Amino acid sequence: QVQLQESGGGLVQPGGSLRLSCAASGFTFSNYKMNWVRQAPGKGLEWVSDISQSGASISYTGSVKGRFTISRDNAKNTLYLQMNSLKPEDTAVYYCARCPAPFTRDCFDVTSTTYAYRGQGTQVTVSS
Template sequence: MLKNFNVFLFSANCTCPKIPPKSFTVQEDGCFEGKYRYKCIPGYTRKPTTSSLIKCEEKNGVSQWGESNFECISKILLFLFHFFKRNLYHVSAKSFISKEREMMVKRPQEVLSLSCRGSGFDFSRYVMNWIRQPAGKTLEWMGAISDDGSNTAYSSRVDGRIEITRENSNSLVHLKLSNLKPEDSAVYYCARDAQ
């Protein structure tokens, strides 16, 4: 049986000055063939659309590191929000109608603000709900707002951090969740209540 091993030797003798520090990265000295690749500390991962590679370049006779947009973000706070409008009490795989999909990244203690627009029904006649589904878990009801917006009810799990409001004139329901925690990572849904 053959095994392949990729071995990279780092040289402490880079012609460039010290590697520019980045937040939440493992600090190492040295480079390989004039290149350096940042690594995130445990619990963090590379932010999409950023590159971990920087190159040692010569400009005007001086060796210096090129520009880098690299950023590490917390793995546990990658949020995927998926909005849908449907009768809350008749939820099945066939009844989900995707309205929007959006990936959002938040950090602990930040505020999450989401809006969902209803269509295809008389929005002002229905109680609207926010529910969520953490990875590998069942749906969790977060709260609801009455058809005229005068009353709200919230789950004890998020009470004190959640606010649900609505704009019937624009068929919109809003969710505001403050002081975010790792356990808030989930797929979020808005849904209309049964009549």
């Protein structure tokens, strides 16, 4: 049975550093592309970054470019999103997402209504 697991989060100070660690089981994680989306109170889902299968292709959103670093390790089926700096604006629940297919480049996990291959999300409250 496909199921995703998430770890890391809680309260953090402004400008601090925190790493989000997620895992999944029930499928060939190495074949599926992984993306990240955040949801703040009142705001919809916002994509922040993604990482291809072999990690050769990586991208970040303009609002988080440089501050965050995404990485994956197929050796243990884990996904990581390193955050070197944080601001009060990025306070939101970070949800992991999987590609709808294991051999495609297009992704549609940005659906704000519902998605079958996204994690439960972990809150990250950044404030003084």
